């Protein structure tokens, strides 16, 4: 048992992976919490090497079923007054954005229930207003969205400053192992339905940067921060949508791995300082908290080598052995 959690969410076959008639190699066992892969294709060889994690979500896994298993325990700790972080790992296209951001699916006006395709970000905000309005707590909710492209920090929330100013950041004398992002826009949310309008602003700004600087989302980290003031508790929840797993980006992810590895093994000299991403979330990983990681993979034999790497990263972060009968 640990405060660090590592789960794996496989994705179905997309039409493109179908269009080339690729065939699955990923086996998801949620009960045993295992996920296995093969090696040969038409050879149908005996390829063991099965992995075990804290939880496993198969191809039929639904969005709500991920929020309940992964986010609900963490949100309660945030409302209690702690800082937390949720991560999404994996090859571009596996489903980090579909898991962290969700969709809407053309169906028009939605009442007050969550969209079935919504992600962690839609659900977390709406559950924040519901749970804190129900227990009559006085609260204020403000969110922030920056983007780490090539290790320079960009705000996707500011309406002004249309191009791209690398935000400056320095350790604030106020709390150590903490930092302050000068100039970072902090949009204050009033209604729970406001979160959908904020994902629109940042989307274009992420697109405007993707076209006028080659700041494609696939090659950048996405940090969503929601802070909750309550009465006197302050809670923060960081939802990080990491860049695709596969000279400077491949270092920030390996740094984050070194951290979580160091966080799981109680080891000293965890090098938060080795990257901008780990330095920002330092106040969310050092101070004892609940950290969760979601590694998204593809079931096609097309992406065999990357699906193995991603699972390999997850094993390195929190190593747990496979138990009897693999
Ligand atoms: N669990 C899922 N259910 C349905 N569609 C999914 C799922 N995961 C991914 N997708 C689909 O795959 C794409 C989402 O990939 P994306 O989130 O961009 O990966 P990444 O964010 O890691 O680059 C979309 O085409 C979406 O339709
Ligand atoms: Mg994406």
Bridge partners (DSSP) of residue 187 are 143
Which value in Å is the resolution of this experimental model? Answer: 3.0
Query: Does a structural domain hold residue 184?
Result: yes
- As for how many domains the chain has, the answer is 1
**In a domain? residue 186:** yes
C-alpha span between 59 and 298 (Å, rounded):
9
The answer to whether residue 322 is domain-embedded is no
The continuous run of DSSP H or E covering 130 comes out as: helix 120-134
> Which of these, 318, 301, 296, 234, lies nearest to 89 by C-alpha position?
296
What residues have CB less than 8 Å from 322, skipping those under 6 apart? 34, 50, 51, 52
Q: Establish if 30 belongs to a structural domain.
A: yes
* Among protein residues, the one whose CA lies closest to atom 10 of ligand 1: 95
235 lines ligand 1 (CB under 6 A): no
Which of 15, 66, 95 best tests ligand 1's pocket when mutated (most atoms within 8 Å of CB)?
95
Known binding-site positions: 90-97
Tell me the CATH number at 48.
3.40.850.10
Q: How many CB atoms lie within 10 A of CB 50?
A: 16
- One DSSP character per residue, 166-224 reads ---EE--TTSTT--EETT---EEE-STTHHHHHHHHHHHHHHHHHHSS---GGGEEEEE
Residue 300 contacts residue 59 (beta carbons within 8 Å): no
Beta carbon of 94 within 6 Å of any ligand 1 atom:
yes
Distance 321 CA to ligand 2 centre (A): 30
| Ligand 2 geometric centre to CA of 139 (Å) | 32
Write the residue with the smallest CA distance to atom 26 of ligand 1: 98
- Cβ of 310 below 6 Å from ligand 1: no
Q: In this structure, which ligand is nearest to the CA of 95?
A: 1
Residue 323 in any domain: the answer is no
Phi/psi for 300 (5° steps) reads -85, 145
Separate counts of helices (H) and strands (E) for the chain: 10, 14
- For residues 260-292, one letter each, b for 16 or more C-beta atoms within 10 angstroms of the residue's C-beta and e for the rest, the string is bbbbbeeeeebebebbbbbbbbbbbbbeebbbb
3-class SS at 295? Answer: strand
Task: Give domain status of residue 281, yes or no.
Answer: yes
Q: What are phi and psi of 233, to 5 degrees?
A: -120, 145
Q: Is position 182 within any domain?
A: yes
Q: What's the rounded Cα separation, in Å, for the pair 129 and 31? A: 33
Among residues 240, 235, 76, which one has the least CA distance to residue 140? 235
User: What whole-number distance in Å separates Cα of residue 233 and Cα of residue 217?
Assistant: 34
Residue 325 placed within a domain: no
The domain of 232 spans 4-317
């Amino acid at each position: 048992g640990k405060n660090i959690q590592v789960v794996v969410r496989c994705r179905p076959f997309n039409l493109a992976e179908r269009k080339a008639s690729a065939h699955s190699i990923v086996e998801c066992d949620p009960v045993r919490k295992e996920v296995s892969v093969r090696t040969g294709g038409l050879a149908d060889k005996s390829s063991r090497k099965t992995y075990t994690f804290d939880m496993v979500f198969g191809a039929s896994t639904k969005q709500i079923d991920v929020y309940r298993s992964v986010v609900c325990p963490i949100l309660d700790e945030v409302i209690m007054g702690y800082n937390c972080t949720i991560f999404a790992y994996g090859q571009t296209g596996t489903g980090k954005t579909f898991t962290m951001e969700g969709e809407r699916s053309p169906n028009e006006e939605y009442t007050w229930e969550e969209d079935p395709l919504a992600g962690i970000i839609p659900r977390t905000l709406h559950q924040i207003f519901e749970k804190l309005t129900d227990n009559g707590t006085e609260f204020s909710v403000k969110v922030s969205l920056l983007e780490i492209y090539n290790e320079e920090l960009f705000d996707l929330l500011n309406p002004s400053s249309d191009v791209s100013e690398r935000l400056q950041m320095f350790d604030d004398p106020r709390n150590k192992r903490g930092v302050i992002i000068k100039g970072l826009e902090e949009i204050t949310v009033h209604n729970k339905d406001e979160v959908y309008q904020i994902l629109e602003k940042g989307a274009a700004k992420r697109t405007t940067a993707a076209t006028l600087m080659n700041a494609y989302s696939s090659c950048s980290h996405s940090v969503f921060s929601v802070t909750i003031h309550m009465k006197v508790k302050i809670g923060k929840l960081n939802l990080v949508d990491l860049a695709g797993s596969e000279g400077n980006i491949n270092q920030s992810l390996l740094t984050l791995g070194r951290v979580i590895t160091a966080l799981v093994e109680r080891t000293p000299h965890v090098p938060y300082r080795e990257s901008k991403l780990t330095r920002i979330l330092q106040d969310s990983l050092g101070g004892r908290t609940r950290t969760s990681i979601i590694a998204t993979i593809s079931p096609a034999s097309l992406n065999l080598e990357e699906t193995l790497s991603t699972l390999e990263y997850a094993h390195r972060a929190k190593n747990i052995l496979n138990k009897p009968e693999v």
